[PDB]
């Protein structure tokens, strides 16, 4: 069946020129909406959230990883990271790197998270752990966000990465410290403004993760605490035909709006 808000995305999407994908989970009585929910998505920087969950699941049998340095050096840095390059021949904590990779989207500092985690697959099987069985991470920063259509690695679909969301900042996958870290940091954001959030009433609260890459891949992925009622969890991806297209948060905004007015 075909609702009349996915009515409404099919006709967003359509003048975008691109491919919109979202998954929505009300968690007032845990109806999902989507559009191509199933289909997949390079996740670009919205893999973060992944790998900072898998070490905040590490840190719960080891209480000061969080605090445990992590060299960097100038060969570390990679095409974008504002907080990592002042640390350059100095030390980063995990926890440290934890957020400047989620609230900045700080591409070295993912490195790291993904080196403690034992490489890419690390963090596919955290993912697994927590029966997402569609998350996969296959490289490292910043080709894992080359988002070429068609292409299987670092992607992941709209369903299960809401699902997976849910799990992780309103469910216990994690344990109840490290939820509320998690929740801590992604309410801590710096980038979502132009995304999700712009979409939403201005009396709401969220956390989310923006991620941008190539063929104008614009994503974002929110916890939302709207006025009056149980929380959301919010998905929308968004990639372009052209390799060189510009981004467009205002497509995921727009997202957001429909879906909110559907409520
Ligand atoms: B994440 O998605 O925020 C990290 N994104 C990138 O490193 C990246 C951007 O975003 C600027 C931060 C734009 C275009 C790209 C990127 C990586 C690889 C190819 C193209």
Redesign the pocket.
Same mark, same amino acid.
């Given at each position: 069946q075909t609702s009349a808000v996915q009515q409404k995305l099919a006709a967003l999407e359509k003048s975008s020129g691109g491919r919109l994908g979202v998954a929505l989970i009300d968690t007032a009585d845990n109806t999902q909406v989507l559009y191509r929910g199933d289909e997949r998505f390079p996740m670009? !920087?919205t893999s973060k959230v992944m790998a900072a969950a898998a070490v905040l699941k590490q840190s719960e049998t080891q209480k000061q990883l969080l605090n445990q340095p992590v060299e960097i050096k100038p060969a570390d840095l990679v @095409?974008?990271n504002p907080i990592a390059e002042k640390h350059v021949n100095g030390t980063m904590t995990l926890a440290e790197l934890s957020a400047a990779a989620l609230q900045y !989207?700080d @591409?070295t500092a993912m490195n790291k998270l993904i080196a403690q985690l034992g490489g890419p697959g690390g963090v596919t099987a955290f993912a697994r752990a927590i029966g997402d069985e569609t998350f996969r991470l296959d490289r490292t920063?910043?080709t894992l @966000? +080359?988002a070429i259509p068609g292409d299987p690695r670092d992607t992941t679909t709209p369903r299960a990465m809401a699902q997976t969301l849910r799990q992780l900042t309103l469910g216990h996958a994690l344990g109840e410290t490290q939820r509320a870290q998690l929740v801590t940091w992604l309410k801590g954001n710096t980038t979502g403004a132009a995304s999700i959030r712009a979409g939403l009433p201005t009396s709401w609260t969220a956390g989310d993760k +923006? /991620? !941008? /890459?190539?063929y104008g891949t614009t994503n974002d992925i929110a916890v939302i605490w709207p006025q009056g009622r149980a929380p959301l969890v919010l998905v929308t991806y968004f990639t372009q035909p052209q390799q060189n297209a510009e981004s467009r948060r205002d497509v995921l905004a727009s997202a957001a709006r429909i879906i909110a007015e559907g409520l």
């Open positions: 670009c !920087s @095409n974008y !989207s @591409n920063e910043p @966000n +080359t +923006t /991620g !941008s /890459g190539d």
